[PDB]
Ligand SMILES: Cc1ccc(COP(=O)(O)O)c(/C=N/[C@@H](CC(=O)O)C(=O)O)c1O
């Protein structure tokens with residue numbers, strides 16, 4: 097049965113870990129996968145998380161199965177983060193949330209739900225995007241089409257090209273939007289742009305799917321949700337796939353959510369019954385530990401205050417690194433202007449490096465980035481900045 | 493988009509929780525979903541698990557992502573449980589394991605891997621089986637066909653009917669086998685029967701898929717794997733979907749494994765690369781907490797000894813309940829012979845009750861079973877046995 101199976105191609109992101117682990121050179125520098133590091137080059141457990149885990153160890157008295165949709169308090173806390181306290185979507189009972197194994201699991205549940213229960217055949221994704229978006233949607237049988245997004249000459253969102261690309265989308269197609277901290281560009285719509293897209297989407301009949309992996313890493317928790325909220329004010333229906341991996345430092349615990357919104361509570365409840373059936377046929381019900389840590393933190397004033405500050409600390413450290421990177425490239429003799437990196441949002445920016453420069457940086461200098469030129473600024477530290485920048489200048 | 497979605501049908505198992513929770517009557521008795529209860533009618537965290545969780549709280553210093561296939565030590569420990577220390581499959585590097593979100597996730601990963609990478613179109617499942625097997629396989633695009641299994645007049649495995657049914661399977665079809673503690677019948681092949689099926693499967697070209705949700709609940713950890721090991725000795729290729737939910741009391745932490753076996757290490761590694769690609773497009777990588785508890789326990793002599801005894805304790809308590817149930821039915825005036833229940837394995841036996849008897853038991857008596865007549869013996873206790881039996885006698 098398995099004699100002719102052809103090997104799969106390298107995961108362009110996750111595959112970097114095997115290479116990095118196998119690299120026995122001392123001064124190797126990891127700017128690949130999107131995990132936050134602190135000033136020591138490590139990814140500690142958040143203190144709020146350790147406190148919540150201690151509380152769970154002391155107080156949990158069963159591991160009996162969650163419901164298919166997971167912990168109810170987690171769902172309520174997720175909806176309040178997405179839509180705001182006092183949102184009409186919440187008051188009108190228009191949204192149902194399933195806790196999922198990560199943001200990736202939330203994207204797969206959304207795709208399986210749409211493929212099996214709606215007329216959807218195509219999802220529109222930005223060029224460029226996270227490379228796993230295409231794989232997730234195709235695995236559910238959905239075609240992926242690309243829309244233009246990025247002007248690489250001026251390092252801006254090419255809004256006119258984006259609009260033009262999307263004119264080819266039919267009513268009933270899905271359009272995927274990154275909620276904030278676009279991966280890989282770091283370039284997000286302004287609020288006015290989000291409002292223009294919300295009105296356009298209603299006019300053209302697109303179903304919005306928001307992917308919200310980095311809420312809190314651009315400007316703040318509420319500010320980062322403004323684009324999604326502008327869409328929510330205008331649309332009867334949308335889907336949000338969100339993740340708590342980065343903003344709680346809970347990557348390996350697989351904590352995400354798929355939130356379905358419909359015109360009214362009767363419709364969302366009927367539609368959600370099919371989303372639950374799609375989950376039951378995949379992984380049955382979701383992992384409790386990470387979600388119970390998030391719900392424990394978000395529902396306790398003291399833990400929530402500690403956590404919000406830890407998130408602010410991460411965001412501010414990445415901003416300090418963007419500035420230190422730009423300043424150090426100049427000092428090490430880089431040819432050009434990299435000042436666009438300062439304005440960008442989230443863990444990632446596009447260095448502008450070619451696929452060959454990125455390969456040379458790994459092979460010759462032990463500096464690991466993604467082949468698209470995406471660099472994880474959150475992997476930069478005061479201690480590794482100089483060698484990193486010297487290596488980059490050397491490949492320019 | 494969602495205006496016409498038809499509501500999904502009740503999950504015949506998981507749906508019982510909403511009904512049971514909503515039932516405000518005092519003496520309600522839960523014999524539905526397959527979760528173990530102790531003599532108090534509760535599902536505590538195992539002591540070995542609490543000890544391992546304390547160790548993790550003290551010693552974990554990151555939540556950085558696992559590999560797509562999860563914790564390497566967990567994979568090694570799973571293979572040794574499945575195949576035995578010193579197995580040729582392990583020595584020859586013929587098996588690769590992915591840690592998955594539960595046994596359900598392992599079944600879905602297997603199905604997506606087979607659908608996308610092999611000629612498989614059909615999976616053969618026993619009539620009766622767990623009702624979610626059909627949903628999982630159909631969600632991946634595979635047809636499900638049934639094979640005869642159970643003689644309900646004599647309460648035995650109808651081996652001749654099983655063989656006859658399977659003559660219709662073509663070479664390259666998958667046949668699903670429950671490794672031990674068949675759900676819902678509790679009736680497993682004898683070792684000779686397993687050996688006969690292993691030889692038949694090789695002759696007819698079937699790809700075996702073992703589902704191993706209850707290792708340790710029939711007779712013991714090694715004894716329960718004898719049928720799988722008889723198949724492993726005869727086959728170049730097979731797949732095992734296993735779960736640690738019941739045997740570690742870790743249901744909500746989603747701890748399972750998908751193990752692929754091929755003729756040699758080159759083939760299994762090539763085939764496994766595609767299994768990893770199927771996982772990446774589903775939930776990306778698996779939840780660490782529960783798997784790290786299992787690996788911590790299985791790799792430490794002291795914790796492993798505590799755990800093995802806790803599992804023996806669960807198994808023996810269920811056996812005591814089978815005997816107490818049979819004795820108490822007789823004392824409360826049940827018409828017939830229920831002595832077949834004593835011989836059966838695992839959490840479940842078929843009571844023989846009709847779908848209407850089961851509905852009446854819920855509506856009139858607050859006793860909750862599955863509509864197939866399956867009862868969770870592990871939900872029975874000395875304190876609830878008399879009212880339970882009185883109710884059953886009342887509906888006969
Ligand atoms: C836009 C976007 C959507 C969804 C995910 C997956 O997050 P999860 O851990 O499943 O909650 C990522 C994550 N990107 C990271 C890590 C990854 O590739 O797995 C990255 O781009 O390096 C992402 O960047």
Ligand SMILES: Cc1ccc(COP(=O)(O)O)c(/C=N/[C@@H](CC(=O)O)C(=O)O)c1O
Nearest residue numbers: 380505525526594595596622675705735737
């Ligand atoms: C044969 C079989 C294969 C796979 C599973 C799922 O276990 P997981 O928790 O995903 O590791 C069950 C579980 N059966 C239980 C609970 C359930 O239906 O979800 C049951 O039959 O009540 C099962 O009985």
